[PDB]
Design a protein around this ligand. Structure first.
Ligand code: NA
Ligand code: NA
Length: 506
């Protein structure tokens, strides 16, 4: 079952309309800002991953929202007050005010590399969907996705408005709910779906398994996901700039609350879609049967399976997962180019020119876009899910950056030697665990996948590399904090009297 004729027509019409809208807004109050904040992480990555994870691991996936809530509370009262009352353009200027320009450069480069890899996986996800629905080879699908993404970004100009992001979130939620409704009406009713999921053990919210090898758990979500969401929202420049651009500090807090509500809505809808998807494929699992090869192919298969008599709805869902992910990728790439120009190029060439800078920014946008496309191709060639891949790519690189920020805001004795040594230690540890886990992946029974049906190595691998992927970034943050403090107190602790008003204790 591939795209029908009307499915192609609907996808083409909506994609052309969205591309034209994005290339026309261009060439020719706390609610919207929070909704645009929410429609900056959510893309086709979540649409592909969260339902698959909820089907394979159960309803315990909802603790991702608890991790998001902890991050949102931390940002609202810990990072936002400083980043707002201080008014210092880029968040990495704080690392200059606190430690040194070396730390500022290190943090900026960390952000750039993490964003480039994350945007690569984000770009890969729509190519995966277009591969699976239209049968086009993954390489030609990636070529098409890159062409449309670079027309969005560079040759047409990014159009990111808070209002197009709101429309994206609305259509995402409505699509999840429509899939849910069709699935449940096909499967009898909500009571029967709940009974079949309770019998088959996909209702497993209260999971407090102490083992870090278990992929998903209350602990893995609160102490592994919170650093990820802090690196995504509380410290990330592209979000904190929106926080500071809001007039009055309370307005940013309200925007954060609206962002948290939107995130919870999206995650809950996707997890319900995942449980309904499992119950639909109860005795004829397509992965076991071999109809699909990876869990990332679960959701478009369900979309094309349950909308067979409604020609063109899979086309609409593909169009919305394509335009809405390419918008996020374009926004990330242009944010990367602006960060490079206004943090690393403009300071060191004072009188370069003002017309030189538009050319340089366009070049950086193209360069980052091509680099992210290469990341997408390598993500294809290495396999693996898009959700966990994005989580790992962001965590392993941005955990030490979060540790540096936390050491600056919390510990007055931290200095440039300590913070830089701790950043190095964090990157080393995160890369070690990530690469060792890639070489030796944990088994599915160890990870805790739930059973399906189709009727109808080094001794450090089994312990250290087998921990959950949500811990790769948190591990880096913790080793950054520990090494930074230990080296700061050895190399000469900064005196509080010799610190500007950037400490959290005021
Ligand atoms: Na998005
Ligand atoms: Na995403």
């Amino acid at each position: 079952a591939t795209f029908g004729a009307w499915d192609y027509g609907v996808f083409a019409t909506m994609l052309l309309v969205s591309t034209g809208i994005g290339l026309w807004v261009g060439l020719a109050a706390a609610v919207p800002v929070g909704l645009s904040l929410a429609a900056s992480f959510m893309s086709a990555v979540q649409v592909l991953g969260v339902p698959a994870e909820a089907a394979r691991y159960g309803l315990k996936f909802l603790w991702m929202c608890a991790g998001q809530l902890l991050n949102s509370l931390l940002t609202a009262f810990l990072f936002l007050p400083i980043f707002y009352r201080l008014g210092l353009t880029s968040t990495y200027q704080y690392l200059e005010l606190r430690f040194s320009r070396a730390v500022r450069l290190c943090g900026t480069l960390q952000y750039l590399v993490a964003t480039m890899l994350y945007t690569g996986i984000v770009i890969y996800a729509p190519a995966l969907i277009l591969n699976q629905v239209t049968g086009l080879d993954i390489w030609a699908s990636l070529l098409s996705t890159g062409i449309i993404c670079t027309l969005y970004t560079t040759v047409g100009g990014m159009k990111a408005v808070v209002w197009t992001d709101v429309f994206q979130v609305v259509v995402m939620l409505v699509g999840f709910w429509v899939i849910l409704a069709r699935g449940v009406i096909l499967l009898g009713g909500p009571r029967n779906v709940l009974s079949l999921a309770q019998q088959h053990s996909r209702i497993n919210l209260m999971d407090f398994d102490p083992d870090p090898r278990s992929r998903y758990t209350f602990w893995t979500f609160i102490v592994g996901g919170t650093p990820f969401w802090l690196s995504m929202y509380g410290v990330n420049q592209a979000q904190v700039q929106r926080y500071v651009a809001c007039h009055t500090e309370g307005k940013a807090k309200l925007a954060l609350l609206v962002n948290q509500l939107g995130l919870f809505l999206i995650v809950a809808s996707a997890a319900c879609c995942g449980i309904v998807m499992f119950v639909y494929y109860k005795d004829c699992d397509p992965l076991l049967t071999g109809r699909i090869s990876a869990p990332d192919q679960y959701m478009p298969l369900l979309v094309l399976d349950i909308f067979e008599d409604l020609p063109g709805v899979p086309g609409l869902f593909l169009a919305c997962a394509y335009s809405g992910t390419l918008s996020t990728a374009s926004t990330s790439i242009n944010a990367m180019a602006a960060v490079t120009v206004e943090d690393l190029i403009k300071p060191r060439m004072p009188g370069l020119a003002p017309r030189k800078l538009v050319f340089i920014s366009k070049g950086l946008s193209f360069i980052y876009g091509s680099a992210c496309l290469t990341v997408a191709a390598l993500s294809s060639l290495l396999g693996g899910g898009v959700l966990q891949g994005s989580f790992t790519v962001m965590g392993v690189i941005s955990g030490p950056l979060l540790g540096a920020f936390t050491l600056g805001m919390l510990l007055p004795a931290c200095n440039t030697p300590g913070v830089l040594s701790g950043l190095a230690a964090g990157l080393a540890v995160s890369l070690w665990v990530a690469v060792g886990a890639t070489l030796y992946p944990p088994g599915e029974q160890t990870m805790g996948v739930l059973p399906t049906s189709a009727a109808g190595r080094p001794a450090l691998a089994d312990t250290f590399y087998a921990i959950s992927y949500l811990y790769y970034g948190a591990l880096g943050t913790l080793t950054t904090m520990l090494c930074g403090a230990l080296i700061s107190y050895l190399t000469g602790p900064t005196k509080r009297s010799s610190l500007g008003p950037g400490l959290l204790w005021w």
